[PDB]
């Protein structure tokens, strides 16, 4: 017996508009041949794919991370500025391909401006330095007559970009990261970079590298807990079995609350509201090369759908979140020399970003849950979830309080469900429901079938108490009031 109950009159908390953020690295074809393709028939003036550019504006990306995860650890931002042509061609150790560097800081901020996204830049703590980091910040933000501020002007860009989010290193814990450090090395370093940098520009937000090692996090929070604003968390899941995949949205839940509690345990970090930044998270188990062009199907899209619902109701501790990428590399939008194609993961965002409120409202659901055991992300790391709901949901209200969105996810495949929803004091209106699903849990869009998995409206008469059946493996948003 399932049933959900919403009370639009009771606001619980805001929903950080930045939970819907995306990430874009210089990996494989994410940049070159993805959002950027110089002199292509589909690309515009500045080399931006117009067809990609649309798909991106359609899901109003809030903030965009760049230039990377692994890449950034051997990236020197100064090779990305100044006229192109004269920019050095370097060899990226991360994914082993040459970097023409024609897509640099200036180009990224332009792309951000164009899609109305707040840039989120992450510095290089591998082969880079503190002087180098400061300079990049000088170049992007301040307006004095310091060398780098003026350099920005000489190149474009007389007005300062004002990048608000700075990722202080990337997965510095990893033996695979160029110049990886120990818990104490990185810990004491995060504080040094954040300490200064912030004396130059007090307004920036700093995201420190966090991960699954408790001692790591704890040592980072303990050292820089009085100056950093977030602690980074990366979550990659996946498996062939439908449930092993969708059910990990509830594993991510326990994981986040885990990190949450570590923060509570470090006096300085708890005093300042240090929060979690889930700056890297998607499904990823199939491909394990250096193009990472994962073929996402509806199964994965549902997971994505669930994650957004989760965040929707946890944005108070995880205000910042970034999908793996949004282009080819673990991409949400797959590209080709002559076209585009939106994967179920992209759809999940299309649905929730355009049908979601700025405030979370008392919403209480009752599902049949289950227990599971499965693997994860390609080495098939073992994991287990307990009491994962078959149905979950989140009710949001627009800013002006005149519109309600009840997003629900039926995480069952062999079943549709006729749950009695109820909205305290609603009355009889003619709401419309946008639902996202498709043929089977393995459906996916192609170049010739750009619509196998898609969003579809449908009208309904709703009352203070009513019913609506949700298809198996579906994600729906009843838009009322």
mmCIF file with all atom_site columns, N, CA and C in Angstrom, residues 42 57 60 182 322 345 385 394:
data_model
loop_
_atom_site.group_PDB
_atom_site.id
_atom_site.type_symbol
_atom_site.label_atom_id
_atom_site.label_alt_id
_atom_site.label_comp_id
_atom_site.label_asym_id
_atom_site.label_entity_id
_atom_site.label_seq_id
_atom_site.pdbx_PDB_ins_code
_atom_site.Cartn_x
_atom_site.Cartn_y
_atom_site.Cartn_z
_atom_site.occupancy
_atom_site.B_iso_or_equiv
_atom_site.pdbx_formal_charge
_atom_site.auth_seq_id
_atom_site.auth_comp_id
_atom_site.auth_asym_id
_atom_site.auth_atom_id
_atom_site.pdbx_PDB_model_num
ATOM 1  N N  . UNK A 1 42  ? 27.826 23.158 -38.029 1.00 0.00 ? 42  UNK A N  1
ATOM 2  C CA . UNK A 1 42  ? 26.863 23.294 -36.936 1.00 0.00 ? 42  UNK A CA 1
ATOM 3  C C  . UNK A 1 42  ? 27.278 24.278 -35.858 1.00 0.00 ? 42  UNK A C  1
ATOM 4  N N  . UNK A 1 57  ? 20.761 25.204 -23.152 1.00 0.00 ? 57  UNK A N  1
ATOM 5  C CA . UNK A 1 57  ? 19.977 26.305 -22.613 1.00 0.00 ? 57  UNK A CA 1
ATOM 6  C C  . UNK A 1 57  ? 18.609 25.774 -22.177 1.00 0.00 ? 57  UNK A C  1
ATOM 7  N N  . UNK A 1 60  ? 18.185 24.860 -18.034 1.00 0.00 ? 60  UNK A N  1
ATOM 8  C CA . UNK A 1 60  ? 18.819 26.078 -17.533 1.00 0.00 ? 60  UNK A CA 1
ATOM 9  C C  . UNK A 1 60  ? 19.951 25.780 -16.566 1.00 0.00 ? 60  UNK A C  1
ATOM 10 N N  . UNK A 1 182 ? 49.020 13.210 0.313   1.00 0.00 ? 182 UNK A N  1
ATOM 11 C CA . UNK A 1 182 ? 48.516 12.398 1.417   1.00 0.00 ? 182 UNK A CA 1
ATOM 12 C C  . UNK A 1 182 ? 47.433 13.202 2.105   1.00 0.00 ? 182 UNK A C  1
ATOM 13 N N  . UNK A 1 322 ? 26.995 18.628 -9.350  1.00 0.00 ? 322 UNK A N  1
ATOM 14 C CA . UNK A 1 322 ? 27.345 18.650 -10.758 1.00 0.00 ? 322 UNK A CA 1
ATOM 15 C C  . UNK A 1 322 ? 27.349 17.280 -11.446 1.00 0.00 ? 322 UNK A C  1
ATOM 16 N N  . UNK A 1 345 ? 19.603 10.443 -19.364 1.00 0.00 ? 345 UNK A N  1
ATOM 17 C CA . UNK A 1 345 ? 20.158 11.245 -18.282 1.00 0.00 ? 345 UNK A CA 1
ATOM 18 C C  . UNK A 1 345 ? 19.851 12.708 -18.573 1.00 0.00 ? 345 UNK A C  1
ATOM 19 N N  . UNK A 1 385 ? 21.948 -1.879 -0.145  1.00 0.00 ? 385 UNK A N  1
ATOM 20 C CA . UNK A 1 385 ? 21.042 -0.847 0.322   1.00 0.00 ? 385 UNK A CA 1
ATOM 21 C C  . UNK A 1 385 ? 19.952 -1.489 1.136   1.00 0.00 ? 385 UNK A C  1
ATOM 22 N N  . UNK A 1 394 ? 8.869  14.376 -4.108  1.00 0.00 ? 394 UNK A N  1
ATOM 23 C CA . UNK A 1 394 ? 9.174  15.661 -3.513  1.00 0.00 ? 394 UNK A CA 1
ATOM 24 C C  . UNK A 1 394 ? 8.318  16.748 -4.108  1.00 0.00 ? 394 UNK A C  1
#
